[PDB]
Amino acid sequence: KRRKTEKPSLSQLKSQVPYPQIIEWYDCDARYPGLLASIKCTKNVIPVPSHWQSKKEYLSGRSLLGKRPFELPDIIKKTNIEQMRSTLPALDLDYKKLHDVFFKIGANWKPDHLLCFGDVYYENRNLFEETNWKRMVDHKRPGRISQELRAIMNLPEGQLPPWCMKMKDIGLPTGYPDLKIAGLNWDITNLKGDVYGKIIPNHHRNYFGALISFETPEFE
Amino acid sequence: KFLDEATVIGADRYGNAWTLRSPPECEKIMSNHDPSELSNGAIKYPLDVITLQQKLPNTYDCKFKFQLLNHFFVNDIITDFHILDSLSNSDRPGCIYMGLQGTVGCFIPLLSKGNVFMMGNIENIMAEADDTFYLDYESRKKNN
Amino acid sequence: AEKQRQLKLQKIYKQKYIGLGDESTTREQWQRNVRNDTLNTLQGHSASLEYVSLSRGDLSIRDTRIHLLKSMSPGYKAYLREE
């Protein structure tokens, strides 16, 4: 009773904290709030996954209904057993082939997503969309437009995007000062296919561990 | 100390000898950008980094993290690391350390692979070698 | 039954290994375990013991060791105060 009503306000607790935004309303009933704020707000600690205080047993997810059953890592998919055995609703294989797939072909191979120091998987999360996202931030760059989005845009080949004219009056993108586009800052004769422009960088090892040779263990 | 631009040597008060490396995601950014734009100005960080800033501001405040590269435990407390481009004209540059309780030891980067493959297999042998002797000595007791 | 066994193993592991936070443990009880284990390792490794000896600058090293031993008990602060 008295101890329950003795609690300091969470904002009174914020001042003790160097990173006050992590502390939350429920920290008021922390039996040792001044300590718990220091631990929770300590540098490298990773806050408890928030699926607690929910009674849903951490997975009720509607998204769980729409998750793909599985996908082979493409290196293993090269092994062709996908066609040999149909998992969806005998296939003689070579020892050298499989062994080389894991070792010769797949030594340097690593899953593309993984996760980071403090990455924690909440129920509603799905990594796959973020994998295509990270891969997409990689492939796609300004000045280039795929033929699909080009067809939807109804832009014929050899013709500049509609924002090149408004970009002539307004100016180059503030975010891309080094961006070049045919007809304006960049040679129109170099206009080719899906690329109407490219960023021209103005910036222009061994890491003590350079192996200088790569030799995998041989099965034979 | 520094081995390189992107990697660091460090010891512990408790005797850990480790080496860390900045992630390639950071090396690309600093290689492709000027430092003046880091504090203020436009530097485009992938979506995950920012979400780690608002999600975990305490750990990711520095917006990158060292992936552990090498870790080791030498029961001494290392006083001085020195990175020598060559040890007695040897090609592979070593790093030699003197410990407080006194010791001097080295970490030699292994070129190629089957160097560390053969070394790794020998270390794996000598690791449980006492157990292999115990299992042989056990089987001979089963026969006797 | 299973949880009930985990209670008994809680009593046994707590007996052997001393401080193990069960469910509710006061910060005074737990922080004492922290201090005791940290000092325990500082004096336990001849390495870190040699280190603290020099950085502290004591005349002998066993002064630092038995210092940590004494520093394990709470009343040692008031003991130093009474010197």
Binding site: - | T19, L69, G99, Q101, C106 | -
Partner: peptide, 29 residues
């Protein structure tokens, strides 16, 4: 892609000199 993965080879050149324990017995003849 080349894996960085620095492979370090630890050697103790000179062995720890602070002598923490001793015994007086006669071991080998």
């Amino acid at each position: 892609a080349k894996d960085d993965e620095l492979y370090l080879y630890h050697l103790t050149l000179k062995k720890q000199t602070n002598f923490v324990h001793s015994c007086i017995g006669h071991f080998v003849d």
